[PDB]
Amino acid sequence: STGSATTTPIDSLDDAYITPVQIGTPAQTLNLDFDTGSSDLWVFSSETTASEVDGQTIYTPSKSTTAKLLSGATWSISYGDGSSSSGDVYTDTVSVGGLTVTGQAVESAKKVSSSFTEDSTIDGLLGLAFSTLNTVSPTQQKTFFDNAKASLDSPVFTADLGYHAPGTYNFGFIDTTAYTGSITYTAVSTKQGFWEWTSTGYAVGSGTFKSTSIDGIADTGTTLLYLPATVVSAYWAQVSGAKSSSSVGGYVFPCSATLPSFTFGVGSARIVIPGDYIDFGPISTGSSSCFGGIQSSAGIGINIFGDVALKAAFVVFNGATTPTLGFASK
């Protein structure tokens, strides 16, 4: 089997991407944030505290003839941005782009933090990291990809995120029309539960490539590119007026600037992020200070190849017995 679904930016900055997902019988379609940095499929629901729902579409398990309470199971998750959610668990039929999994754990939110309530466009998350990170207790549950894998034509999914435009998540096949050149594959460590890999270096603009190993995660659920402070300083030093602002929470730059590109290495190959992809717009409405799309990872503990980096590439998440990551230009 295969599936193919379009993923759409939630706003004009590509702050996140939503993909329609069918849950239950008859189908209830929710728009979920596919997140290769986590491993829980959770949704706003008929059980979510009413004051914490503000415009999201909800899953109502009592209206699904295939929903079954997973008795005793609870979940609770906290994300790197400080947001969180928790609740109980049903199993139900879940389909993405024509690919159907029966018995998928659907984690129903009883509580969500303010940032989820405040984002009316995201109805939940669909985790695509390794199932060892799934938070369901006392019986850990499998991701949608893990459950689908055996049925797929090939044990892979691909992320093809657009810049200010829709893109595609494919399951079970590699669309050879969706990229240019060849795909360069690189090793993955699953020891932390992430799609963790080592970039071979970077360049700023037209500058020379610096060969240096940068360990990080491929994370579709993170907006920006978080890299070591040395790398980030070298980038922003090429932008007149750019500075790190403790009050804003990162590097800012004059909105009048033209940003240089940023290149990262994948083996001997190179992915170029155009400068425009690094512009996240005014820090507040009407400001002439703009927020940078490359930020320091120094306070995180891990480097994160988020959407800013991933949307410059066609990315293969290869879930074979030894997982690997593939990157192609497009």
Swiss-Prot record:
Stated family = Belongs to the peptidase A1 family.
Q: Which residues form the active site?
A: 35, 199
For biological process, the GO terms are: proteolysis
The answer to whether keyword Hydrolase applies is yes
Its recorded name reads Endothiapepsin
Q: What class of enzyme is it?
A: hydrolase
Q: What is its EC number?
A: 3.4.23.22
Instruction: Name the keywords, alphabetized.
Output: Aspartyl protease, Disulfide bond, Hydrolase, Protease, Signal, Zymogen
Q: Which parts of the chain are coiled coil?
A: none
This chain's source organism reads Cryphonectria parasitica
